[PDB]
Design an enzyme around this catalytic site. Structure first.
Site, mmCIF file in Angstrom:
data_model
loop_
_atom_site.group_PDB
_atom_site.id
_atom_site.type_symbol
_atom_site.label_atom_id
_atom_site.label_comp_id
_atom_site.label_asym_id
_atom_site.label_seq_id
_atom_site.Cartn_x
_atom_site.Cartn_y
_atom_site.Cartn_z
ATOM 1 N N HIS A 153 0.845 -1.193 0.000
ATOM 2 C CA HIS A 153 0.000 0.000 0.000
ATOM 3 C C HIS A 153 0.878 1.239 0.000
ATOM 4 C CE1 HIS A 153 0.473 -0.268 4.493
ATOM 5 N NE2 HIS A 153 0.425 1.048 4.392
ATOM 6 N N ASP A 203 0.249 -7.717 1.798
ATOM 7 C CA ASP A 203 0.738 -6.352 1.756
ATOM 8 C C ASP A 203 2.262 -6.309 1.653
ATOM 9 O OD1 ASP A 203 0.280 -3.554 1.599
ATOM 10 O OD2 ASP A 203 0.056 -3.317 3.724
ATOM 11 N N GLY A 242 3.882 6.538 8.360
ATOM 12 C CA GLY A 242 5.121 6.601 7.613
ATOM 13 C C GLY A 242 6.209 5.661 8.067
ATOM 14 N N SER A 249 5.346 2.248 8.392
ATOM 15 C CA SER A 249 5.024 0.960 7.776
ATOM 16 C C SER A 249 6.230 0.518 6.939
ATOM 17 C CB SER A 249 3.806 1.047 6.880
ATOM 18 O OG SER A 249 4.161 1.707 5.697
HETATM 19 C C1 LIG Z 1 -3.145 -8.596 8.362
HETATM 20 O O1 LIG Z 1 -3.122 -8.271 6.979
HETATM 21 C C2 LIG Z 1 -3.244 -6.933 6.609
HETATM 22 C C3 LIG Z 1 -3.415 -5.963 7.610
HETATM 23 C C4 LIG Z 1 -3.527 -4.632 7.176
HETATM 24 C C5 LIG Z 1 -3.480 -4.289 5.798
HETATM 25 C C6 LIG Z 1 -3.598 -2.956 5.410
HETATM 26 O O2 LIG Z 1 -3.778 -1.964 6.382
HETATM 27 C C7 LIG Z 1 -4.120 -0.592 6.030
HETATM 28 C C8 LIG Z 1 -2.903 0.301 5.664
HETATM 29 C C9 LIG Z 1 -2.552 0.897 7.039
HETATM 30 C C10 LIG Z 1 -1.480 1.976 7.351
HETATM 31 O O3 LIG Z 1 -1.700 3.162 7.268
HETATM 32 N N1 LIG Z 1 -0.320 1.520 7.829
HETATM 33 C C11 LIG Z 1 0.806 2.281 8.377
HETATM 34 C C12 LIG Z 1 1.542 3.436 7.642
HETATM 35 O O4 LIG Z 1 2.251 4.243 8.216
HETATM 36 N N2 LIG Z 1 1.422 3.523 6.328
HETATM 37 S S1 LIG Z 1 2.128 4.626 5.534
HETATM 38 O O5 LIG Z 1 1.844 5.952 6.025
HETATM 39 O O6 LIG Z 1 3.516 4.308 5.615
HETATM 40 C C13 LIG Z 1 1.570 4.478 3.948
HETATM 41 C C14 LIG Z 1 2.478 3.631 3.069
HETATM 42 C C15 LIG Z 1 2.524 5.142 2.954
HETATM 43 C C16 LIG Z 1 1.542 1.685 9.577
HETATM 44 C C17 LIG Z 1 0.329 2.548 9.828
HETATM 45 C C18 LIG Z 1 0.663 3.904 10.466
HETATM 46 C C19 LIG Z 1 -0.285 4.528 11.214
HETATM 47 C C20 LIG Z 1 -1.706 3.966 11.484
HETATM 48 C C21 LIG Z 1 -2.814 4.560 10.594
HETATM 49 C C22 LIG Z 1 -4.261 4.395 11.090
HETATM 50 C C23 LIG Z 1 -4.913 2.996 10.976
HETATM 51 N N3 LIG Z 1 -4.806 2.543 9.564
HETATM 52 C C24 LIG Z 1 -5.760 3.180 8.641
HETATM 53 C C25 LIG Z 1 -3.914 1.589 9.137
HETATM 54 O O7 LIG Z 1 -3.106 1.034 9.882
HETATM 55 C C26 LIG Z 1 -3.922 1.254 7.616
HETATM 56 C C27 LIG Z 1 -4.807 0.073 7.241
HETATM 57 C C28 LIG Z 1 -3.548 -2.648 4.059
HETATM 58 C C29 LIG Z 1 -3.355 -3.675 3.141
HETATM 59 C C30 LIG Z 1 -3.391 -3.334 1.703
HETATM 60 N N4 LIG Z 1 -3.838 -2.265 1.058
HETATM 61 C C31 LIG Z 1 -3.754 -2.392 -0.308
HETATM 62 C C32 LIG Z 1 -4.141 -1.482 -1.406
HETATM 63 C C33 LIG Z 1 -5.652 -1.649 -1.557
HETATM 64 C C34 LIG Z 1 -3.841 -0.031 -1.116
HETATM 65 C C35 LIG Z 1 -3.297 -3.593 -0.862
HETATM 66 S S2 LIG Z 1 -2.911 -4.587 0.543
HETATM 67 N N5 LIG Z 1 -3.260 -4.955 3.507
HETATM 68 C C36 LIG Z 1 -3.318 -5.278 4.825
HETATM 69 C C37 LIG Z 1 -3.191 -6.618 5.243
HETATM 70 C C38 LIG Z 1 -3.029 -7.711 4.197
#
Ligand SMILES: COc1ccc2c(O[C@@H]3C[C@H]4C(=O)N[C@]5(C(=O)NS(=O)(=O)C6CC6)C[C@H]5/C=C\CCCCN(C)C(=O)[C@@H]4C3)cc(-c3nc(C(C)C)cs3)nc2c1C
Ligand SMILES: COc1ccc2c(O[C@@H]3C[C@H]4C(=O)N[C@]5(C(=O)NS(=O)(=O)C6CC6)C[C@H]5/C=C\CCCCN(C)C(=O)[C@@H]4C3)cc(-c3nc(C(C)C)cs3)nc2c1C
Ligand SMILES: [Zn+2]
Ligand SMILES: [Zn+2]
Lengths: 12, 178, 178, 12
Positions: free
Chosen positions: B55, B79, B135, B137
């Site tokens: 993502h 992911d 940010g 992840s």
């Molecule tokens: C157990 O399995 C899973 C479990 C979760 C998954 C998931 O989760 C989604 C992405 C995730 C995220 O923002 N991650 C981080 C990040 O900080 N993220 S970040 O800011 O770094 C962003 C990359 C730039 C680490 C988080 C930082 C702060 C928390 C944000 C508030 C809560 N929230 C909305 C989330 O945690 C979201 C939920 C997304 C995805 C996918 N999404 C996609 C497409 C549709 C987009 C393909 S696969 N798969 C998942 C799988 C499989």
């Protein structure tokens, strides 16, 4: 279609 | 562990390299700070492969010393993406000690304790503001020996504070390496 | 600490791969058994880097998935070379518990006790014929946590029998990076 | 100008 770019690092 | 961050390009350096696909900067560390044109996150190297979230990086190439590196793996369901790690990239070794003391490394180089609750879950010792984990992840979760347990994927949040973390477990990074 | 070896190619296969420099084989494990046309020895992965002895590898490239790998590091002063470990290789983490109980791993996957006596020196607890350590240069010296203390360089003999071993310490491997 | 070749492994 653009690239992911390394813009820094966390050294442990 | 102790941890520190180093910036290595600016905003414009980043957009440009994004277009060229060519990065000649020297790569050090186990944990890379990565960027597309619109977002930033982390990548961690384990077993000579540089890993991050779908993502985040989607299906993108990684800018590298001989031009764009194609992904070795693209597992949307988990992911998980990975490229052959660029030269200079340090690899972590997979954790094998089933420990429940975990430490998440974030983009700010904070190492924060997380209590393991399942194969891909841990609770934060203190909850955090969502803005503070955004940010990071693709960052690693470490066991007390400093091996990689997995990489940061999602947070579980009650009203803006993250209470627990989801991560890609390292056994499943090895699996996807067949 | 426990060990097992697996041979993955034969005489003709090794000569060929030597000439082309392209090894598609699946890589894995911490310690590679490596060969040139003239000799055989080991190579140990620590932190993303495949480390081995200059007196075995000389200036050579490593055969790999995408053709030859050029050496990142070449330190004749230490008898040390390194390539970027190829995807699949499992790196060890540097020892940081300065213990003096070490384990040397040979090309036959014997793990033998050696007592640390100085920062690049250890003694064996029973003498060994030289032919028993021969071909094991590049192999890991290990702490009881299975972390890497250095790589086997040479043996110290009294009257032609091995009673001590000399090794490139992990600390000097860190110094040649940077 | 030949290459070093992985001819086996040791797993720990
Ligand atoms: C157990 O399995 C899973 C479990 C979760 C998954 C998931 O989760 C989604 C992405 C995730 C995220 O923002 N991650 C981080 C990040 O900080 N993220 S970040 O800011 O770094 C962003 C990359 C730039 C680490 C988080 C930082 C702060 C928390 C944000 C508030 C809560 N929230 C909305 C989330 O945690 C979201 C939920 C997304 C995805 C996918 N999404 C996609 C497409 C549709 C987009 C393909 S696969 N798969 C998942 C799988 C499989
Ligand atoms: C204190 O610092 C040093 C210290 C030692 C160095 C050294 O050491 C020489 C190589 C070494 C050796 O054969 N090592 C091993 C091996 O098993 N080896 S092996 O069989 O695997 C061999 C690779 C194929 C692991 C040993 C196995 C069995 C014992 C054999 C009898 C004793 N003996 C003659 C030695 O130990 C020799 C001494 C060689 C060299 C170099 N040699 C060269 C080339 C150009 C000749 C360039 S630099 N540098 C050194 C430096 C800097
Ligand atoms: Zn562990
Ligand atoms: Zn140790």
């Amino acid at each position: 279609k653009g690239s992911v770019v390394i813009v820094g690092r966390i050294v442990l | 562990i102790t941890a520190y961050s180093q910036q290595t390009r600016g905003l414009l350096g980043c957009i440009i390299t994004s277009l060229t696909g060519r990065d000649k900067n020297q790569v050090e560390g186990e944990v890379q700070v990565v960027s597309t044109a619109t977002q930033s996150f982390l990548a961690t190297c384990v077993n000579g492969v540089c890993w991050t979230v779908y993502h985040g990086a989607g299906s993108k190439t990684l800018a590298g010393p001989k031009g764009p590196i194609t992904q070795m793996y693209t597992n949307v369901d988990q992911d998980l993406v990975g490229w052959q790690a660029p030269p200079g990239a340090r690899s972590l070794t997979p954790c094998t000690c089933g420990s429940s003391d975990l430490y998440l490394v974030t983009r700010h180089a904070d190492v924060i304790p997380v209590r393991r609750r399942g194969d891909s879950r841990g609770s934060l010792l203190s909850p955090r503001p969502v803005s503070y984990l955004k940010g990071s992840s693709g960052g690693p979760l470490l066991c007390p020996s400093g091996h990689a347990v997995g990489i940061f994927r999602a947070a579980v949040c009650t009203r803006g504070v993250a209470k627990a973390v989801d991560f890609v477990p390292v056994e499943s990074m090895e699996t996807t390496m067949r």
